[PDB]
Amino acid sequence: YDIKAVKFLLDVLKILIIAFIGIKFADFLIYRFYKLYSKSKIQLPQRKIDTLTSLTKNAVRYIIYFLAGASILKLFNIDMTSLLAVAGIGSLAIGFGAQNLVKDMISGFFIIFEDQFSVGDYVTINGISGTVEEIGLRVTKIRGFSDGLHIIPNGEIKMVTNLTKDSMMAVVNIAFPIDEDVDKIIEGLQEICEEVKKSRDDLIEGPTVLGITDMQDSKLVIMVYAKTQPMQKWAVERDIRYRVKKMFDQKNISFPYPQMDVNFKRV
Amino acid sequence: YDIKAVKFLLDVLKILIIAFIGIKFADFLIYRFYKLYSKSKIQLPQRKIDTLTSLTKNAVRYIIYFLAGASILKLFNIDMTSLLAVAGIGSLAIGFGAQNLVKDMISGFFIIFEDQFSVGDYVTINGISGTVEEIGLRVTKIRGFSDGLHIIPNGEIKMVTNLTKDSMMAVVNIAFPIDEDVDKIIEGLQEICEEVKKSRDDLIEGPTVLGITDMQDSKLVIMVYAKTQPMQKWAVERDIRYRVKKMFDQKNISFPYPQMDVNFKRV
Amino acid sequence: YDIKAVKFLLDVLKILIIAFIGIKFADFLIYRFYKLYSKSKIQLPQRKIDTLTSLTKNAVRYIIYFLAGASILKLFNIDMTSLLAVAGIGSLAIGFGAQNLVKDMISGFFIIFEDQFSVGDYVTINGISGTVEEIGLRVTKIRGFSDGLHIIPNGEIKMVTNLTKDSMMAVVNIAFPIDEDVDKIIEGLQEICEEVKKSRDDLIEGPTVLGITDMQDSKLVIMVYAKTQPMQKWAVERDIRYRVKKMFDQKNISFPYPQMDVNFKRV
Amino acid sequence: YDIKAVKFLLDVLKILIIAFIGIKFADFLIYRFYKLYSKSKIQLPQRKIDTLTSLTKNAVRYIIYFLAGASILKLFNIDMTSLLAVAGIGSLAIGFGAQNLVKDMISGFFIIFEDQFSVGDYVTINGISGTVEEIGLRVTKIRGFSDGLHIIPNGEIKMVTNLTKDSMMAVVNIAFPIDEDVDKIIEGLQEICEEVKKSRDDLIEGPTVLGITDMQDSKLVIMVYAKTQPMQKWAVERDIRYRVKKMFDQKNISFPYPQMDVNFKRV
Amino acid sequence: YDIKAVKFLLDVLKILIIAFIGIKFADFLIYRFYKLYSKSKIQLPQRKIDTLTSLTKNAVRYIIYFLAGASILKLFNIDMTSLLAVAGIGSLAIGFGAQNLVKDMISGFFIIFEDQFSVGDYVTINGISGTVEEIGLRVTKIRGFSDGLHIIPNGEIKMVTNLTKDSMMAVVNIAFPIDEDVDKIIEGLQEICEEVKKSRDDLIEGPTVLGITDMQDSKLVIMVYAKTQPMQKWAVERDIRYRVKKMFDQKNISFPYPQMDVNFKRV
Amino acid sequence: YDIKAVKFLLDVLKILIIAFIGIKFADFLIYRFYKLYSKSKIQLPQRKIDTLTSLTKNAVRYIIYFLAGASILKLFNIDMTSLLAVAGIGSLAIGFGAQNLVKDMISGFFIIFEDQFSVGDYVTINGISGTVEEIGLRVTKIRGFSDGLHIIPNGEIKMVTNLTKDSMMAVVNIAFPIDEDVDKIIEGLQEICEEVKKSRDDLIEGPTVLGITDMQDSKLVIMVYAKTQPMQKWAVERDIRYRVKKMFDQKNISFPYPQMDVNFKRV
Amino acid sequence: YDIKAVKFLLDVLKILIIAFIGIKFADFLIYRFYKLYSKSKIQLPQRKIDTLTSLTKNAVRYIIYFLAGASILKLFNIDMTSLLAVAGIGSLAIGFGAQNLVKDMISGFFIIFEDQFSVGDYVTINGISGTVEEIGLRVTKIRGFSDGLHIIPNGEIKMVTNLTKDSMMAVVNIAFPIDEDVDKIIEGLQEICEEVKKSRDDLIEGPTVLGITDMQDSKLVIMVYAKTQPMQKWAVERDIRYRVKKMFDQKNISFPYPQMDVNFKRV
């Protein structure tokens, strides 16, 4: 007439005392990871830490409940494989929904750690470009000129192209009619290059004229370029453009107006 | 002649009393999570809470049924691995169909918690732009001017670019014929910048003229820009455009009409 | 000389009596879930319910067969892990092919439950727009003007933008030559706004003229807008367009004809 | 000196007699599911059923071999988890390669069961449009006018838009110069609407003129529309187009020729 | 002082004799599946069968090694779950990398079995079109006119549209100026239809004129169509085009030259 | 007072001697698979084989460590399921990161084995075209004319279209004004066909004129085509183009200059 | 009255002493893998190594905690399958989030090992082109002219096309009016080819004229090409362009101006 109900009550008593120990233990650890991060009130307000700490506490309570519960269910002869094919709906949903969060974190870790870019560089990252403002661990902030502030999760960084770095390149493609006199234009472009090499202090390499970079229908295109100091690219381009307009005027050279020629019939 | 039928009836009696205890226990917990969320009738109507609470109750009944059932099946010597390869069709279908729901909730949690944007900012989020109206946990609402109200699930937020924030940037690209007189145009643009810096109180930085931002075929393009107070961008741009038309008129300057030039043959 | 063949026949007899019990039990449950949903013949015809109920019954028969079978196979010393790596082909194929069905259902549940839109609103949902006609749980129906009836599964709803709701916005972008007289045009547009504010009862806000919304090459574009009652947007726009044509006529103002200017050589 | 070799030979004898029983059992079931589907020679030729039945038989033979084999391997002390990590290559490859097949079947089941469309409707399904010819369970056939016969697997049906159904809408967008006389044109369009309302019997709603649906550069566009009987849409549109050309002729109205205006310099 | 070393050596001896038996057994089965497929040298050269058979043999050797090895490792008290988390790297990599192969085979099976197309039809399959040359089980070959020979794996077949089949449709959209005389043109097109109905034997339905299929700016488009025998579509279209050019000539009708009209200022 | 510490030390001694045996065994196998592949120094340099063999050795050391370790951890009563949920992070990451590698190898195996193309054919493969230079097992090399050398991993081959093979097709679409005289042009094109059939030895089929392949606005297009020897396509097309220009000259035929016709107003 | 509490305290003492041993063991191994990589301060600063080593240490502490903890939880009768469905959320999230890291490493290994490109070549890799600056194991650095520095993770390398290598090809497509004299133009192009073959030392093959590579509307296009030394392509093209402009001038040949011809009506 059975004396195993003893081992039974022993076990359910073990599960209960261990779940209690675990709960108090965890409320202690959450309170400590609380107060230690609470008085050095740097990275977070006591409104966020509150909701975050409450969130941690609730997660640990529910986990501990589920565990004690399924263990005690095991004791009343419920099958743990069926219990697994039910709890595994949550294992799967959460486990996979969280993978983006983990991808963000790993990616961010390498962005920060490989110094792919620092809190001031101008970068183009996934078709969007701007000046980096914050580098978080999960998320990166980047303010374009006029574009507004872009907030990009780190997992979404396919390629990150960094302008700046070891200086930028400024480039102007100026187009003339094919029609036109090449050597005159090229000599005038070089005069602009010299005037700008003297007149600026942000440029490290150029300006330089390199040949006919392109030829098509009724226009031929020549390129001037120049290595500039970080964030000066556009200033230099705008300057070169102004001077090129001026040189179109003084040197009396035709503008690259589109140029058709038509045959006539009257009827 | 066997005296194990005792341990057998003992077991199936344990499964049944535990499934009963679990069902009553859960109907109690659902009734409490019911009435506690029921008289503080804030976020939900008693039509929604009804269907939602009925839904929870039915899910717990079906889970408990499945558990008791598979355990009793285990008792009649049915294999739990085959039972698993059957129940796992549901574990997989539900577990993965729900991963979007979980992704939404994680993403939403970070949107709210990192204050990526507040209930008033103007944001562009996945090619769609508008003024945010609700920030849920699963879903975000965003009303574009004329666009209608966009409802976006949170898991679908690749990048969220926020305009507004620390002020916007207003930009006008005005285009003149290459043909034209640069310094006159630039000086007049600066007169418009001064008149607008005086004439407005929403601007915090500009307006400012920066050089020849672009040059092509028969037009050259100059840019004025100006940091404005949140949501004033467009007002400022429209103002600057009006003034620039006016200045085209008074200063007598040619409009940037497309400009071909054609050669003739008669035949 | 063995007396375990007894426990053996006992077991296979247990598996058989349990599979029998399970089959009768389920044909009973299917017959009840049948007749209860059968005389309240609302949502389904007795041709659909027949094929659906037959389908349920066959699924339960095949599952029960597979279970009894794999258990009896376990009894003749067949390994349940190899049996698992065979049955798991079906666990995987079905479990994952069904995940879209589950995704549809979850999504649909939230569409209905968050009242994202009701059986009358005009919505644009994944590049397709129309008037919603049915809101199912798995699938949504939406009839565009001329487009035909679109049937969209719920899992395919990335964003659902809802026009209507708290009223629509009607917008007309009218374009004039840059060439033209701005204040005359604007005053005339305001006369059209006043005449339409008087002459209609669907509009709740506009009409209103806001500045030069755009300026380019040989055209400048002005915008009139107006908040209208649900589904009136287009009536209002068509009206404003008519009146704007009329105002081009009476006020004698040039149409925005594209405007080149060409230089001549003869040869 | 061991008397367990008895239980050993007993076991391998059990695995063998059970694999034999299983093979004969299955060849019987395949032969019956053969002859029963063989004399009602409706949906399949005895060339297809032959290769399909041969295919079923071989699959069951190979599965039964693998099972008996891995069980006997278990008996010579081979580990079933390593055996699992080998067989699972096939469990995974097949299990997942077959998921499209399962997706097709589920989708098709719902297409047929929700009567999303019947064997005659004209549907646009994933950018492709045509008249449905067969509705299978795995695959749908749809013949476009001139397009050829499209065969679409059911799992690939994102949205299925069905034209026809509760009648179609025929739409003509006729464009006139802005230049032109609106009320004359509108009255003439209404005369065409009346003449067509009289002259046809396939239309159920229109034809109707609704206002200036669009206005741009040198054209303004008016829309006539009309609900028609299934598959008459295009007949009605072609008719309305013919009559509109006729009305351009008789009423002497200018065609919407693109309309530039150009300024001259000679040089 | 232990007499279990006997059962130990017994076991490792069992694993060894079973791995030996399995290896000889498999080399026999590979040699037979070799010579049986070797003298009926149809589908394969004895250079392919050699490398394929060698490949099979090596796979079976390595699998048998891994099995015997992990079993003997189990015997020296190595844990099979850790062994599983190592071998499962290969289970996963291979199991999933092979899923495309399995997808190809399933898809190909259905293409062949549902006779979606035969070794002569002209099909468009995933944006690519051509005449089918081989129908494999894994891969399909399709030679476009000028395109070269396309080799498409079967798993990549989303939709397969088959032209040919129950005949093709040939279609010519001829465009006239709006300017023009409709009934003359239509009557002339019908004369071309009659002359071609007489003059060909590949057509089964047309040719036929159906109305104004389109109207825009300065062109109106009329469509002639005709059901033709498989692969004749293009011959018919080219013939109809030639005849339509001839009819433009004889009947003296204006070609659909783009038609602007321009206003002049001199300055 | 326990005499199981004996079986304990026995076990950990078994794990240690088996890990030692396994390590020496593997360093031997690596040294042999080393020296055997080392003196037939064909496919690899002794710098690659060094780093590759060192890599193999380190992988086997770490695997053997992990196994011995987890087994000894099992002995001190550490749970192997928790150990599994930790090691499985690596099982998953590696197992899935390697699936591309396996996909490449399978695909490459079939490319090589089905002789889809050989080391000289001109192929277009995923939008990129070129002449194949190497066919590896993991990766394929393909050098475009001017394009540079493309290196494509095998798993990335959706479709591979092979030009060459049973000869190429050369195609020239020449366009004339609609305006023009069709039979003259066609007869002249045939004279070019004959002159080229005589004048070349790389062509196997053409050249041939087939009708009006296209008719539009102000141009009608005729096609000449011809089956050529592998890699001659372009030579033939270039030749036919030259001759067609020559024939435009001699036969005095109008070029297909775009052809508008304009109406005039002065104001 | 139980004497198993002895084996109990024995076990938990075993778990504790093994977790202690493992912790000290690991802090030792981390300190060694620290100091050995610390004084050879090459690839890393002692700021990075610090944070990386601290990171390793913390990871191993948390893993060891989780293990000891779950083992001791197993001892108080907590179920390890439920414990597995909780820890598996992390196994899944981390295991899958890290798969990109693994993919990068494998890919990079093959890039380095197959010398697909070296630290100087000019490559186009996923639509982005530039000169390679660093080849890491996880990530590749590539600086475009003007483009800025692109940092690409290795897993994102679909195809990597390498220009340079066995020399580059420089290509110029020059276009003339159809109108024009072909043999004159071709002979002149050949004179430019000869002048450039003499005048350069970077070219290894060309320059060479090959026929009418293209013919259309009012232009015909001829191609000159030439194999050049690595990185000279563009110099050569720019030179050939300059010379071709010069040759348009001297030889007096018409530029390829777009060429319409128009018919007149006055009204």
PDB file of C-alpha atoms in Angstrom, chain F residues 2 8 44 47-49 51-52 55 62 72-73 75-86 88-90 92-98 100-101 125-126 128 138-139 141 143-153 156 172-175 219 237-238 240-242 244-246 248-249 255-266, chain G residues 7 10-11 14-15 17-18 33 63 66-68 70-71 74-75 80-81 83-84 87-88 90-92 94-96 98-99 102-103 106 109-110 112-116 157-167 169 171 178-183 186 210-215 217-218 220 223 225 233 259-267:
ATOM      1  CA  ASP F   2      31.650   3.765  -1.861  1.00  0.00           C
ATOM      2  CA  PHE F   8      34.737   6.764 -12.224  1.00  0.00           C
ATOM      3  CA  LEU F  44      48.512  23.514 -55.107  1.00  0.00           C
ATOM      4  CA  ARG F  47      52.334  27.524 -49.090  1.00  0.00           C
ATOM      5  CA  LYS F  48      48.635  26.779 -49.589  1.00  0.00           C
ATOM      6  CA  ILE F  49      48.853  23.113 -48.594  1.00  0.00           C
ATOM      7  CA  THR F  51      48.024  26.674 -44.253  1.00  0.00           C
ATOM      8  CA  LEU F  52      45.237  24.279 -45.328  1.00  0.00           C
ATOM      9  CA  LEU F  55      43.805  24.497 -40.646  1.00  0.00           C
ATOM     10  CA  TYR F  62      39.392  21.705 -31.224  1.00  0.00           C
ATOM     11  CA  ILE F  72      34.217  14.614 -18.629  1.00  0.00           C
ATOM     12  CA  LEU F  73      31.706  17.402 -17.804  1.00  0.00           C
ATOM     13  CA  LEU F  75      30.863  12.755 -15.557  1.00  0.00           C
ATOM     14  CA  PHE F  76      30.812  15.534 -12.932  1.00  0.00           C
ATOM     15  CA  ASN F  77      27.015  15.614 -13.343  1.00  0.00           C
ATOM     16  CA  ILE F  78      26.735  18.518 -15.817  1.00  0.00           C
ATOM     17  CA  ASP F  79      23.577  18.223 -17.931  1.00  0.00           C
ATOM     18  CA  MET F  80      24.137  17.438 -21.639  1.00  0.00           C
ATOM     19  CA  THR F  81      20.932  19.206 -22.810  1.00  0.00           C
ATOM     20  CA  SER F  82      22.139  22.591 -21.479  1.00  0.00           C
ATOM     21  CA  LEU F  83      25.571  21.804 -22.847  1.00  0.00           C
ATOM     22  CA  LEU F  84      23.709  21.146 -26.127  1.00  0.00           C
ATOM     23  CA  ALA F  85      21.809  24.488 -26.086  1.00  0.00           C
ATOM     24  CA  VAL F  86      25.192  26.188 -25.668  1.00  0.00           C
ATOM     25  CA  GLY F  88      24.256  24.487 -30.636  1.00  0.00           C
ATOM     26  CA  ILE F  89      24.913  28.164 -31.102  1.00  0.00           C
ATOM     27  CA  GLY F  90      28.011  27.060 -33.006  1.00  0.00           C
ATOM     28  CA  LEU F  92      23.732  26.551 -35.999  1.00  0.00           C
ATOM     29  CA  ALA F  93      26.082  29.406 -36.965  1.00  0.00           C
ATOM     30  CA  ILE F  94      28.616  27.149 -38.706  1.00  0.00           C
ATOM     31  CA  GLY F  95      26.097  24.630 -40.017  1.00  0.00           C
ATOM     32  CA  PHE F  96      24.183  27.417 -41.796  1.00  0.00           C
ATOM     33  CA  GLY F  97      27.092  29.719 -42.763  1.00  0.00           C
ATOM     34  CA  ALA F  98      28.569  26.709 -44.593  1.00  0.00           C
ATOM     35  CA  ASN F 100      26.506  28.306 -49.334  1.00  0.00           C
ATOM     36  CA  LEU F 101      29.780  26.424 -49.631  1.00  0.00           C
ATOM     37  CA  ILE F 125      25.258  33.796 -66.678  1.00  0.00           C
ATOM     38  CA  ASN F 126      23.164  36.004 -64.403  1.00  0.00           C
ATOM     39  CA  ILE F 128      26.972  38.905 -67.012  1.00  0.00           C
ATOM     40  CA  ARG F 138      33.302  25.932 -56.069  1.00  0.00           C
ATOM     41  CA  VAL F 139      33.829  28.795 -58.486  1.00  0.00           C
ATOM     42  CA  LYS F 141      35.828  32.183 -64.072  1.00  0.00           C
ATOM     43  CA  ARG F 143      36.305  36.928 -68.956  1.00  0.00           C
ATOM     44  CA  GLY F 144      34.146  39.441 -70.802  1.00  0.00           C
ATOM     45  CA  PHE F 145      35.488  41.459 -73.700  1.00  0.00           C
ATOM     46  CA  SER F 146      36.558  44.668 -71.917  1.00  0.00           C
ATOM     47  CA  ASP F 147      34.404  43.683 -68.898  1.00  0.00           C
ATOM     48  CA  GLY F 148      37.356  42.259 -66.987  1.00  0.00           C
ATOM     49  CA  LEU F 149      37.475  38.798 -65.420  1.00  0.00           C
ATOM     50  CA  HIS F 150      34.294  37.819 -63.550  1.00  0.00           C
ATOM     51  CA  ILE F 151      34.575  35.224 -60.788  1.00  0.00           C
ATOM     52  CA  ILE F 152      31.192  33.719 -59.983  1.00  0.00           C
ATOM     53  CA  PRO F 153      30.517  31.284 -57.142  1.00  0.00           C
ATOM     54  CA  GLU F 156      24.779  31.801 -57.615  1.00  0.00           C
ATOM     55  CA  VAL F 172      20.873  42.497 -87.835  1.00  0.00           C
ATOM     56  CA  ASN F 173      17.778  44.662 -87.438  1.00  0.00           C
ATOM     57  CA  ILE F 174      17.987  47.347 -90.085  1.00  0.00           C
ATOM     58  CA  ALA F 175      15.421  50.164 -89.957  1.00  0.00           C
ATOM     59  CA  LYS F 219      10.376  53.508 -89.068  1.00  0.00           C
ATOM     60  CA  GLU F 237      26.830  41.154 -87.988  1.00  0.00           C
ATOM     61  CA  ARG F 238      29.548  43.803 -88.409  1.00  0.00           C
ATOM     62  CA  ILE F 240      26.333  42.823 -92.777  1.00  0.00           C
ATOM     63  CA  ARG F 241      26.109  46.305 -91.193  1.00  0.00           C
ATOM     64  CA  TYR F 242      28.974  47.607 -93.320  1.00  0.00           C
ATOM     65  CA  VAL F 244      23.979  47.615 -95.497  1.00  0.00           C
ATOM     66  CA  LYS F 245      25.467  51.107 -95.125  1.00  0.00           C
ATOM     67  CA  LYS F 246      27.127  50.643 -98.511  1.00  0.00           C
ATOM     68  CA  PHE F 248      22.059  52.665 -98.433  1.00  0.00           C
ATOM     69  CA  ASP F 249      24.632  54.705-100.315  1.00  0.00           C
ATOM     70  CA  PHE F 255      18.125  56.889 -93.813  1.00  0.00           C
ATOM     71  CA  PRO F 256      15.594  56.353 -90.998  1.00  0.00           C
ATOM     72  CA  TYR F 257      15.966  59.901 -89.585  1.00  0.00           C
ATOM     73  CA  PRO F 258      13.360  60.578 -86.921  1.00  0.00           C
ATOM     74  CA  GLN F 259      10.575  62.421 -88.654  1.00  0.00           C
ATOM     75  CA  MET F 260       8.193  64.900 -87.070  1.00  0.00           C
ATOM     76  CA  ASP F 261       5.908  67.264 -88.886  1.00  0.00           C
ATOM     77  CA  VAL F 262       4.888  70.525 -87.266  1.00  0.00           C
ATOM     78  CA  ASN F 263       2.108  73.112 -87.663  1.00  0.00           C
ATOM     79  CA  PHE F 264       2.879  76.840 -87.422  1.00  0.00           C
ATOM     80  CA  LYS F 265       1.263  79.860 -85.803  1.00  0.00           C
ATOM     81  CA  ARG F 266       2.948  83.245 -85.520  1.00  0.00           C
TER      82      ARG F 266
ATOM     83  CA  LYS G   7      25.171  10.952  -3.146  1.00  0.00           C
ATOM     84  CA  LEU G  10      28.425  14.424  -3.495  1.00  0.00           C
ATOM     85  CA  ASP G  11      26.927  15.443  -6.842  1.00  0.00           C
ATOM     86  CA  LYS G  14      31.036  17.623  -8.048  1.00  0.00           C
ATOM     87  CA  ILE G  15      29.235  20.252 -10.144  1.00  0.00           C
ATOM     88  CA  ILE G  17      34.303  21.722  -7.965  1.00  0.00           C
ATOM     89  CA  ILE G  18      34.122  21.171 -11.727  1.00  0.00           C
ATOM     90  CA  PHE G  33      46.147  33.726 -25.207  1.00  0.00           C
ATOM     91  CA  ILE G  63      28.405  29.959 -20.084  1.00  0.00           C
ATOM     92  CA  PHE G  66      24.458  28.620 -17.041  1.00  0.00           C
ATOM     93  CA  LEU G  67      25.879  25.104 -17.103  1.00  0.00           C
ATOM     94  CA  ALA G  68      26.471  24.681 -13.342  1.00  0.00           C
ATOM     95  CA  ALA G  70      21.082  24.051 -15.069  1.00  0.00           C
ATOM     96  CA  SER G  71      22.850  20.959 -13.707  1.00  0.00           C
ATOM     97  CA  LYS G  74      18.345  19.151 -12.755  1.00  0.00           C
ATOM     98  CA  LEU G  75      19.283  17.873  -9.278  1.00  0.00           C
ATOM     99  CA  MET G  80      15.861  19.575 -18.723  1.00  0.00           C
ATOM    100  CA  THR G  81      13.523  19.579 -21.783  1.00  0.00           C
ATOM    101  CA  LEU G  83      14.958  24.184 -19.533  1.00  0.00           C
ATOM    102  CA  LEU G  84      15.960  23.412 -23.142  1.00  0.00           C
ATOM    103  CA  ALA G  87      17.632  28.288 -23.273  1.00  0.00           C
ATOM    104  CA  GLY G  88      16.922  27.462 -26.914  1.00  0.00           C
ATOM    105  CA  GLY G  90      19.140  32.065 -27.017  1.00  0.00           C
ATOM    106  CA  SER G  91      20.599  29.107 -28.890  1.00  0.00           C
ATOM    107  CA  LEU G  92      18.391  30.154 -31.841  1.00  0.00           C
ATOM    108  CA  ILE G  94      22.571  33.808 -31.264  1.00  0.00           C
ATOM    109  CA  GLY G  95      23.135  30.730 -33.416  1.00  0.00           C
ATOM    110  CA  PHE G  96      21.353  32.417 -36.366  1.00  0.00           C
ATOM    111  CA  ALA G  98      26.041  34.777 -35.953  1.00  0.00           C
ATOM    112  CA  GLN G  99      25.595  32.943 -39.245  1.00  0.00           C
ATOM    113  CA  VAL G 102      30.496  32.707 -40.196  1.00  0.00           C
ATOM    114  CA  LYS G 103      29.510  33.324 -43.841  1.00  0.00           C
ATOM    115  CA  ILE G 106      34.266  31.369 -44.978  1.00  0.00           C
ATOM    116  CA  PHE G 109      38.969  32.569 -46.444  1.00  0.00           C
ATOM    117  CA  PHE G 110      38.320  31.617 -50.038  1.00  0.00           C
ATOM    118  CA  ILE G 112      42.376  35.156 -49.702  1.00  0.00           C
ATOM    119  CA  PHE G 113      43.142  31.503 -50.459  1.00  0.00           C
ATOM    120  CA  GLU G 114      42.087  31.470 -54.135  1.00  0.00           C
ATOM    121  CA  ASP G 115      43.829  34.826 -54.699  1.00  0.00           C
ATOM    122  CA  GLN G 116      40.714  36.157 -56.413  1.00  0.00           C
ATOM    123  CA  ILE G 157      30.283  39.130 -52.277  1.00  0.00           C
ATOM    124  CA  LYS G 158      27.999  37.497 -54.876  1.00  0.00           C
ATOM    125  CA  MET G 159      30.300  37.901 -57.848  1.00  0.00           C
ATOM    126  CA  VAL G 160      33.604  39.732 -57.743  1.00  0.00           C
ATOM    127  CA  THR G 161      34.657  40.857 -61.197  1.00  0.00           C
ATOM    128  CA  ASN G 162      38.360  41.722 -61.306  1.00  0.00           C
ATOM    129  CA  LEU G 163      39.522  44.132 -64.004  1.00  0.00           C
ATOM    130  CA  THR G 164      43.319  44.290 -64.267  1.00  0.00           C
ATOM    131  CA  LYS G 165      44.771  40.766 -63.876  1.00  0.00           C
ATOM    132  CA  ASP G 166      46.194  39.594 -67.229  1.00  0.00           C
ATOM    133  CA  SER G 167      45.899  43.216 -68.507  1.00  0.00           C
ATOM    134  CA  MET G 169      40.900  46.302 -72.391  1.00  0.00           C
ATOM    135  CA  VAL G 171      37.432  50.622 -75.597  1.00  0.00           C
ATOM    136  CA  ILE G 178      24.892  57.552 -91.035  1.00  0.00           C
ATOM    137  CA  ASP G 179      24.888  60.331 -93.590  1.00  0.00           C
ATOM    138  CA  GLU G 180      28.701  60.021 -93.573  1.00  0.00           C
ATOM    139  CA  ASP G 181      31.591  58.509 -95.582  1.00  0.00           C
ATOM    140  CA  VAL G 182      32.550  55.181 -94.018  1.00  0.00           C
ATOM    141  CA  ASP G 183      35.882  54.299 -95.644  1.00  0.00           C
ATOM    142  CA  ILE G 186      37.719  54.034 -91.007  1.00  0.00           C
ATOM    143  CA  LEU G 210      36.644  46.648 -85.716  1.00  0.00           C
ATOM    144  CA  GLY G 211      33.645  47.227 -87.941  1.00  0.00           C
ATOM    145  CA  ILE G 212      30.267  48.840 -87.567  1.00  0.00           C
ATOM    146  CA  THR G 213      29.586  47.664 -84.062  1.00  0.00           C
ATOM    147  CA  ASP G 214      26.169  49.444 -84.235  1.00  0.00           C
ATOM    148  CA  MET G 215      23.738  51.270 -86.527  1.00  0.00           C
ATOM    149  CA  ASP G 217      18.297  56.046 -86.587  1.00  0.00           C
ATOM    150  CA  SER G 218      20.840  58.780 -87.486  1.00  0.00           C
ATOM    151  CA  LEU G 220      26.512  54.572 -86.885  1.00  0.00           C
ATOM    152  CA  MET G 223      34.714  50.656 -82.041  1.00  0.00           C
ATOM    153  CA  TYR G 225      39.886  48.713 -78.691  1.00  0.00           C
ATOM    154  CA  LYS G 233      42.771  51.509 -69.764  1.00  0.00           C
ATOM    155  CA  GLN G 259      19.072  64.817 -86.897  1.00  0.00           C
ATOM    156  CA  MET G 260      15.367  65.133 -87.359  1.00  0.00           C
ATOM    157  CA  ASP G 261      13.614  66.311 -90.475  1.00  0.00           C
ATOM    158  CA  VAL G 262      10.293  68.081 -90.278  1.00  0.00           C
ATOM    159  CA  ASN G 263       7.313  68.793 -92.573  1.00  0.00           C
ATOM    160  CA  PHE G 264       5.579  72.221 -92.584  1.00  0.00           C
ATOM    161  CA  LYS G 265       1.979  73.426 -92.629  1.00  0.00           C
ATOM    162  CA  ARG G 266       1.018  77.013 -91.884  1.00  0.00           C
ATOM    163  CA  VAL G 267      -2.396  77.821 -90.346  1.00  0.00           C
TER     164      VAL G 267
END
